[PDB]
Amino acid sequence: VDVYGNPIRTQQLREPQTSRLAGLAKEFAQHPAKGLTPAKLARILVEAEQGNLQAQAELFMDMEERDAHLFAEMSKRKRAILGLDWAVEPPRNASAAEKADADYLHELLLDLEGLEDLLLDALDGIGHGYSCIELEWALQGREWMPLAFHHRPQSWFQLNPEDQNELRLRDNSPAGEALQPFGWIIHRPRARSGYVARSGLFRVLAWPYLFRHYATSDLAEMLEIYGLPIRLGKYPPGTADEEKATLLRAVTGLGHAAAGIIPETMAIDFQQAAQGSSDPFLAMMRQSEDAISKAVLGGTLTSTTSQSGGGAFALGQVHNEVRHDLLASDARQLAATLSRDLLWPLLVLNRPGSPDVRRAPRLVFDLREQADITSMAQSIPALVNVGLEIPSAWVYDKLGIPQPA
C-alpha cells in the first residue's frame, strides 16, 4: 500500500489516469491576465477559494510570463534548489537489509533520467501552491520502472466539495475524480498555514504585479502623448466644409511642420499636452519590485541588498540568515514530498516483503555549508596539543572531505 494506507492495485498502473480524459489534452489557456482590473482579480481569487482553480492557475501562468522581475526571482529561487547535490540515506540505525534497500534505491535514482525535470516541475508548487506530476509505470521484466514524468497543468484540477484540502481531476462531474494512488507526485509547499487554494505565493504577489502593470502601462501612454503640444484651431462663421477640412489637416500636420499660414480671422491655440514627470510611476514600480523581492527571496539580499564585502565569514553572513533558511526549507519540503511519493512505490514494488512505513529510506539534500578550511586548520593543532580528542568523523563530514576507504 501507499504511505496513507489506501489499498494499492497494480492493475491500474498500466495506463495513466488521465488517458480516459482525452478532452483535457485539447484545451487551451484562456489568458485571464489580459484586461485585468482589481475587481476582476478579487473575483478570481474569491472564486478560487471556492474550488474554481482553473482561472487562478491560468492567471498565475500569465503573471509568471508577463513580469520579468517576478520571473527572474522565481527562476533564481528554483535554480538554487536544482543545483544541490542529493543522496538517499537509510533510516535511523538501519539494519543490513535496510541499508541494501537504501543503496538499491540510490542507484535507481542515479540512473533514472529526467530527475532534474521532475524537480523543476515539482518546484512550480512554490508559486502555484500545488504541483501534480503524472507517472508512467512500465515493467522491464519483474521490476516496475517510472517510464516518464508528466507535469499536468494546475488548471486540470479542482477542490472536493466535501473537502477543501483534497484535489480532484476535472471529469465534467461536480465532484471531479479522486487522484489515483501511485499515479502522481503532488508537491504542496506550505509558506502559510491554510487551505490549498490560499497556499500559493502568487496569491501574495498578485497585487504588486497589478500595481506595476498599471504603472508601466500608464507611463507608456504618457510617453506616447509626450512631445508636441495639442493645438486647437478656430474658424469664423461662414467657413465651408472644404475649408474646415483644410484647417483640420493643417492643424493635424502643424506639429511636425515647422511653419504654416492661416487667415487673420482664424486662430490656433497651443495647449499643454502632458506636463509632469516619471517620478510617481517609477516610485510605484520600485515599491512593487521591492515587495516582490522581499516576498520571494527575503529583504536582506534582494530588495535591501546586502551590498559587497568579502571575507572568510562573508559566506556565512550572506547565507545563514534568510538565504540558508529559505534554501533549507525548500529543500526539506521537496525531499519529504519525493520520499513520500517516488521512493515508497519503488521500495514496495521492486523489492520483496512489506517493510514498515516508519523505516522507509528518506531522500536527503546536501545542505552542507562551506566551512573556512584555513581558520579551522589553524585551530585544530592547538586543541589537539591541549589534549582534546576530537573525532575524525566530525572533521571529515564538516569539511566535505570523504573518509578514507
Binding site: 487551451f28 489557456a29 484562456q30 489568458h31 485571464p32 489580459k34 484586461g35
Partner: protein, 51 residues
C-alpha cells in the same frame, strides 16, 4: 486471371488476358471563414481564436 480448364488438348484454343484500368481525379477540397484582425486581439475570453 486465367479461365477454366477446357476439354480439348487436341486443337488447343489460345486465349488472351484482359487488361483492366480505373481512372480517377483527385480534386481538392476546401473550406474557410473570414474574421477581423482587431477582434481576435480584442477577445480576452479565449473564444474567436480557437479557429
Amino acid at each position: 486471371q486465367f479461365p477454366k480448364l477446357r476439354e480439348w488438348i487436341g486443337q488447343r484454343v489460345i486465349k488472351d488476358m484482359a487488361a483492366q484500368g480505373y481512372q480517377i481525379t483527385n480534386k481538392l477540397f476546401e473550406s474557410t471563414v473570414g474574421v477581423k484582425r482587431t477582434d481576435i486581439e480584442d477577445d480576452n475570453l479565449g473564444v474567436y481564436g480557437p479557429l
